[PDB]
Design an enzyme around this catalytic site. Structure first.
Site, PDB file in Angstrom:
ATOM      1  N   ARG A  16      41.774  62.481  80.226  1.00  0.00           N
ATOM      2  CA  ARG A  16      43.220  62.363  80.329  1.00  0.00           C
ATOM      3  C   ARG A  16      43.954  63.360  79.438  1.00  0.00           C
ATOM      4  O   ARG A  16      45.189  63.386  79.448  1.00  0.00           O
ATOM      5  CB  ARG A  16      43.656  60.932  79.994  1.00  0.00           C
ATOM      6  CG  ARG A  16      43.188  59.901  81.017  1.00  0.00           C
ATOM      7  CD  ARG A  16      44.050  58.656  80.992  1.00  0.00           C
ATOM      8  NE  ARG A  16      44.286  58.185  79.633  1.00  0.00           N
ATOM      9  CZ  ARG A  16      43.413  57.477  78.925  1.00  0.00           C
ATOM     10  NH1 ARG A  16      42.233  57.157  79.443  1.00  0.00           N
ATOM     11  NH2 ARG A  16      43.716  57.093  77.694  1.00  0.00           N
ATOM     12  N   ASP A  67      29.622  55.767  75.257  1.00  0.00           N
ATOM     13  CA  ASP A  67      29.398  54.966  76.455  1.00  0.00           C
ATOM     14  C   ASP A  67      28.898  55.876  77.567  1.00  0.00           C
ATOM     15  O   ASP A  67      29.477  56.940  77.811  1.00  0.00           O
ATOM     16  CB  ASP A  67      30.677  54.245  76.897  1.00  0.00           C
ATOM     17  CG  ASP A  67      31.216  53.302  75.838  1.00  0.00           C
ATOM     18  OD1 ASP A  67      30.464  52.957  74.902  1.00  0.00           O
ATOM     19  OD2 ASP A  67      32.397  52.905  75.941  1.00  0.00           O
ATOM     20  N   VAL A  84      33.392  58.534  73.341  1.00  0.00           N
ATOM     21  CA  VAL A  84      33.066  59.505  74.379  1.00  0.00           C
ATOM     22  C   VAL A  84      32.488  58.741  75.562  1.00  0.00           C
ATOM     23  O   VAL A  84      31.493  58.022  75.416  1.00  0.00           O
ATOM     24  CB  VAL A  84      32.082  60.576  73.884  1.00  0.00           C
ATOM     25  CG1 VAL A  84      31.762  61.554  74.996  1.00  0.00           C
ATOM     26  CG2 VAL A  84      32.666  61.306  72.692  1.00  0.00           C
ATOM     27  N   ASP A  85      33.114  58.895  76.726  1.00  0.00           N
ATOM     28  CA  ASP A  85      32.745  58.174  77.939  1.00  0.00           C
ATOM     29  C   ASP A  85      32.146  59.175  78.921  1.00  0.00           C
ATOM     30  O   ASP A  85      32.864  60.018  79.470  1.00  0.00           O
ATOM     31  CB  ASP A  85      33.968  57.471  78.526  1.00  0.00           C
ATOM     32  CG  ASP A  85      34.628  56.524  77.539  1.00  0.00           C
ATOM     33  OD1 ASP A  85      33.970  55.559  77.095  1.00  0.00           O
ATOM     34  OD2 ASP A  85      35.808  56.757  77.199  1.00  0.00           O
ATOM     35  N   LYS A 102      65.925  39.372  73.443  1.00  0.00           N
ATOM     36  CA  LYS A 102      65.421  40.016  72.234  1.00  0.00           C
ATOM     37  C   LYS A 102      66.019  41.413  72.099  1.00  0.00           C
ATOM     38  O   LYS A 102      66.380  41.848  70.992  1.00  0.00           O
ATOM     39  CB  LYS A 102      63.891  40.083  72.245  1.00  0.00           C
ATOM     40  CG  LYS A 102      63.182  38.750  72.551  1.00  0.00           C
ATOM     41  CD  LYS A 102      61.804  38.575  71.872  1.00  0.00           C
ATOM     42  CE  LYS A 102      61.152  37.252  72.307  1.00  0.00           C
ATOM     43  NZ  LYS A 102      60.903  37.319  73.802  1.00  0.00           N
ATOM     44  N   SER A 124      39.920  58.873  77.510  1.00  0.00           N
ATOM     45  CA  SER A 124      41.025  59.624  76.951  1.00  0.00           C
ATOM     46  C   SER A 124      40.712  61.113  76.960  1.00  0.00           C
ATOM     47  O   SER A 124      41.628  61.963  77.002  1.00  0.00           O
ATOM     48  CB  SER A 124      41.298  59.154  75.537  1.00  0.00           C
ATOM     49  OG  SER A 124      40.230  59.598  74.718  1.00  0.00           O
ATOM     50  N   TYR A 125      39.426  61.455  76.934  1.00  0.00           N
ATOM     51  CA  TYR A 125      39.077  62.870  76.950  1.00  0.00           C
ATOM     52  C   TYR A 125      39.574  63.531  78.227  1.00  0.00           C
ATOM     53  O   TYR A 125      40.295  64.536  78.184  1.00  0.00           O
ATOM     54  CB  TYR A 125      37.565  63.035  76.812  1.00  0.00           C
ATOM     55  CG  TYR A 125      37.106  64.470  76.834  1.00  0.00           C
ATOM     56  CD1 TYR A 125      36.823  65.112  78.032  1.00  0.00           C
ATOM     57  CD2 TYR A 125      36.948  65.183  75.655  1.00  0.00           C
ATOM     58  CE1 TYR A 125      36.400  66.430  78.055  1.00  0.00           C
ATOM     59  CE2 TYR A 125      36.526  66.499  75.666  1.00  0.00           C
ATOM     60  CZ  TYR A 125      36.255  67.119  76.866  1.00  0.00           C
ATOM     61  OH  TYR A 125      35.836  68.433  76.867  1.00  0.00           O
TER      62      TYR A 125
HETATM   63 MG   LIG Z   1      34.259  54.079  76.041  1.00  0.00          MG
HETATM   64 MG   LIG Z   2      37.303  56.234  75.682  1.00  0.00          MG
END
Ligand SMILES: [Mg+2]
Ligand SMILES: [Mg+2]
Ligand SMILES: [Cl-]
Ligand SMILES: [Cl-]
Ligand code: NA
Ligand code: NA
Length: 332
Positions: A185, A255, A193-194, A77, A182-183
């Site tokens: 990171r 979360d 928001v975790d 490809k 991601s926060y």
């Molecule tokens: Mg989450």
């Molecule tokens: Mg997240």
DNA sequence: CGGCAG
DNA sequence: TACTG
DNA sequence: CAGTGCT
DNA sequence: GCCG
């Protein structure tokens, strides 16, 4: 460890010398994903990361096959996109794919639910609203369809994390709360928001979801619950929806997980991600006869394995023979 | 031939 | 890996 | 259990 | 899809 992404910094993808290739492979990978070809999409995911991280623009069938994550099929490809500038298969994706993407973006509806709705003849969220039989989760997901697809400024994540921490620490000042995903990171925008909660005394974490959630419901902060098993008292996680007070605020995903302090580093590692980073690291542990989860790093079981000592993220990297990575370098 | 994270 | 039904 | 979501 |  050139064959593992958990062994390398994710910043390698910052200088992508193959966008014209990866931008087209991403389209194929998404079609396979929403169509349920989970493994073919996974291979495409790993090839797109390998291509995104390669040092030079790829130019040769031989050069391409040598890259881990790229075999014969993927090489062909590539040589096609290089020669002709276009990739023919992109014009032969099932016409079902766009609708399947629409439906599988309903929180709670996956590939099997999407394929079913498509077979039954539904083609729009309007059809879904008015004819599909929805679960409690899918109904909330549908109601916040746009909001759950929208990312928020990392500054808003900090407000949401602060709301949670003040509530929690209100009735136990010793609680530690940490924003992950991601926060942690370092991304500028966050899809949700975790929040990670524990108590460093090893025991005061137990039986706090109930107090915390009522506190956060008494404030009107929480607007919907997606997953929240709060009858058995063994609650480990919470998934729901919140909104900060005042004008111009959107509904954001939230979360929360509560963990015993003994599992902090592993819980911290899992929640910080990325997801592909986690699967890479966990796949690496298996080869070394170990088993990594949000709970612990342990040895393989008896045809019950030992739990290795992991007081910090650093120790998990060290026991797997990996150089440490700041959370920002785990963005695979 | 089968795994692909837990 | 933990939920839902 | 299948299906789904979390990183 | 890729890998061992
Ligand atoms: Mg989450
Ligand atoms: Mg997240
Ligand atoms: Cl990998
Ligand atoms: Cl740590
Ligand atoms: Na290869
Ligand atoms: Na979905």
């Amino acid at each position: 460890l050139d064959k593992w992404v958990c062994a390398q910094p994710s910043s390698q993808k910052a200088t992508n010398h193959n966008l014209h290739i990866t931008e087209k492979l991403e389209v194929l990978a998404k079609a396979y994903s929403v169509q349920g070809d989970k493994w073919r999409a996974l291979g495409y995911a790993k090839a797109i990361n390998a291509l995104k991280s390669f040092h030079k623009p790829v130019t040769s069938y031989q050069e391409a096959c040598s890259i881990p994550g790229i075999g014969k099929r993927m090489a062909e490809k590539i040589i096609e996109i290089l020669e002709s500038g276009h990739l023919r298969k992109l014009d032969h994706i099932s016409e079902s794919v766009p609708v399947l993407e629409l439906f599988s973006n309903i929180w709670g509806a996956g590939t099997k639910t999407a394929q079913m709705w498509y077979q039954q003849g539904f083609r729009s969220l309007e059809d879904i609203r008015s004819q599909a039989s929805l679960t409690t989760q899918q109904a909330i997901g549908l109601k916040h369809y746009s909001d759950f697809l929208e990312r928020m400024p990392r500054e808003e994540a900090t407000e949401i994390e602060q709301t949670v921490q003040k509530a929690a620490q209100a009735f136990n000042s010793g609680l530690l709360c940490v924003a992950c995903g991601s926060y942690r990171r370092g991304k500028a925008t966050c899809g949700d928001v975790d929040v990670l909660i524990t108590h460093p005394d090893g025991r005061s974490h137990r039986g706090i979801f109930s107090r915390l959630l009522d506190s956060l419901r008494q404030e009107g902060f929480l607007t919907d619950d997606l997953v929240s098993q709060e009858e058995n008292g063994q609650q480990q996680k919470y998934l729901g929806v919140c909104r900060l007070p005042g004008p111009g605020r959107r509904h954001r995903r939230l979360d929360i997980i509560v963990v015993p302090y003994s599992e902090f580093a592993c819980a911290l590692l899992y929640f910080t991600g990325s997801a592909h980073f986690n699967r890479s690291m966990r796949a690496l542990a298996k080869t070394k006869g170990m088993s990594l989860s949000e709970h612990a790093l342990s040895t393989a079981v008896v045809r019950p394995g030992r739990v290795l000592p992991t007081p910090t993220e650093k120790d998990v990297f060290r026991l797997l023979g990996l150089p440490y990575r700041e959370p920002a370098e785990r963005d695979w």
